[PDB]
Amino acid sequence: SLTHRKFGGSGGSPFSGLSSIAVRSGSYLDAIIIDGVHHGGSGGNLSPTFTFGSGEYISNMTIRSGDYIDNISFETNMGRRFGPYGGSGGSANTLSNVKVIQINGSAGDYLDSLDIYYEQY
């Protein structure tokens, strides 16, 4: 059921809960690091951390996936790019004209899966 509700008044400036992202990656995604928390194994190489600016969100996103997440890249509403990181296995899926709200998933020694919650425009 993805829904939302707003509480409170009109002032202040917006913020998002999803503030930064890095991955460890080789032939697949070994890990995803979200707001500085690590999920997945120790294999592969650690990427730079992408930290969202104020009012910046993921608008375009590409994931390769089979049994695991094989690869990820994304772009933001401000033309900033992350990746691609990972291998060529899996099949490509793309999200276009979106605003990503949250990234959940499941992870063992590898990044098994990703659940992306988002708005579709």
Ligand X SMILES: OC[C@H]1O[C@H](OC[C@H]2O[C@H](O)[C@@H](O)[C@@H](O)[C@@H]2O)[C@@H](O)[C@@H](O)[C@@H]1O
Query: What does the binding site for ligand X look like in residue numbers (CB under 6 A)?
Result: 11-12, 25-28, 30, 43-44, 65-68, 70, 89-90, 108-110, 112
CA dihedral 44, 49, 55, 61 (to 10 degrees): -20
Cβ-proximal residues to 99 (8 Å cutoff; 6+ apart), any chain: 57, 58, 59, 77, 118, 119, 121
**8 A C-beta contact, residue 84 and residue 73:** yes
Part in contact with a second copy (CB under 8 A); list of ranges 15-23, 42-50, 73-81 = 15-23
Cβ-proximal residues to 97 (8 Å cutoff; 6+ apart), any chain: 59, 60, 120, 121
Q: How far is the CB of 110 from a second copy (least distance, A)?
A: 8
Q: Which of residues 44-63 bind a second copy (CB under 8 A)?
A: 63
Nearer CB in complex with ligand X: 18/46:
46
Q: How far is the CB of 98 from a second copy (least distance, A)?
A: 8
Tokens 């020694």 locate to: 109
Q: Which residues bind a second copy (CB under 8 A)?
A: 1-19, 34-37, 39-40, 63, 65-69, 90, 93, 95, 101-108, 110-121
